[PDB]
Design a protein around this ligand. Structure first.
Ligand SMILES: COc1cc(CN2CCc3c(cc(C[n+]4ccn(C)c4N)cc3-c3ccc(F)cc3C)C2=O)cc(OC)c1
Length: 309
């Protein structure tokens, strides 16, 4: 008798549910931190809440005047924030489905948003090329960062909220000190279409519109891993670290597939087939081996896939 380390070579994600309901392109899907829910945003101006395990439709949340690009959960899974083409963000109580606050200040489309781990702040990126930091409790804009010289494609807090990472079509990835709003680091140039901090908080996963994902050690400023084989030259596609089982990288792709790479070897380990348009968003369940994927207007569905590892 001994204790062994399971080292799976590939996952075996298989389609379990397809979720219909949105009437235009789906823009973003996100699992709630408590693992109970999936939230989706769409160009149809709606947010929809679904059961994370069975995909059962739970509710529709409305009030935005134009399409919604992004949604994000608070740490206690009780709030959502949404970024809209109506130039506002909205903070919602998920239980009631009612808008708590409207965050106004951006002068163009709001493309991306996130809570910080404490969930007392919200960070947003916009087509107006700025990154804004908002107080959740008052709804007031605390700071406006002249972050980029093109639309901001992603914003993400690190694990204690002390840092913000942003990316833009201007070709830059920047790291900002949350407290001061000042730039701590710039990495520079094809458009950077997505960025996010790793689960361990030490790395940055960055996508560029040359069909490339890169894992960077941001402090050393060194690229540690690169993942290719998918198609990404036009859209800002969400990517993820999958850490509940084997250590994978997950992304959508413009060839309508979900790509899964071995994080360490960078080999493609799985390709998920089923969507009929660009897989613009993917998300990984916080505790179970479950992936949600969502596609653009020729498809308009969300799919839930499950793996044994
Ligand atoms: C030439 O100029 C440009 C061109 C584009 C191209 N584009 C615009 C439309 C879009 C895109 C990506 C995502 C996915 N999405 C949401 C948040 N996040 C962090 C990521 N990744 C959603 C949506 C979107 C937005 C609102 C809706 F109502 C419906 C949809 C489908 C995307 O790729 C971006 C751009 O700046 C960012 C400048």
């Amino acid at each position: 008798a001994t204790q062994s380390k399971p080292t799976p070579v590939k996952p075996n994600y298989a389609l379990k549910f397809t979720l219909a309901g949105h009437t235009k392109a789906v823009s973003s899907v996100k699992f709630s931190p408590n693992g109970e829910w999936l939230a989706s945003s769409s160009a149809d101006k709606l947010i929809k809440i679904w059961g994370a395990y069975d995909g059962k439709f739970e509710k529709t949340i409305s009030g935005h005047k134009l399409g919604i690009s992004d949604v994000a959960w608070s740490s206690d899974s009780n709030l959502l924030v949404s970024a809209s083409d109506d130039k506002t963000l909205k903070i919602w109580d998920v239980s009631s489905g009612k808008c708590l606050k409207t965050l106004k200040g951006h002068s163009n489309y709001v493309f991306c948003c996130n809570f910080n781990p404490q969930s007392n702040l919200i960070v947003s990126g916009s087509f107006d090329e700025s990154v804004r930091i908002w107080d959740v409790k008052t709804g007031k804009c605390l700071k406006t960062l002249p972050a980029h010289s093109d639309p901001v494609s992603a914003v993400h807090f690190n694990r204690d909220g002390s840092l913000i990472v942003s990316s833009s079509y201007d070709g830059l990835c920047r790291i900002w000190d949350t407290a001061s709003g000042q730039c701590l680091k710039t990495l520079i140039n094809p458009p950077v279409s997505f960025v996010k901090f790793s689960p361990n908080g030490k790395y940055i996963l960055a996508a560029t519109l040359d069909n490339t994902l890169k894992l960077w050690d941001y402090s050393k400023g060194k690229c540690l891993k690169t993942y290719t084989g998918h198609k990404n030259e036009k859209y800002c596609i969400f990517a993820n670290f999958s850490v509940t089982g084997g250590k994978w990288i997950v992304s959508g792709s413009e060839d309508n597939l979900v790509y899964i790479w071995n994080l360490q070897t960078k080999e493609i380990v799985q390709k998920l087939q089923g969507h009929t348009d660009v897989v613009i968003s993917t998300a990984c369940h916080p505790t179970e081996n479950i992936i949600a994927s969502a596609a653009l207007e020729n498809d308009k569905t969300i799919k839930l896939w499950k793996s044994d590892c």
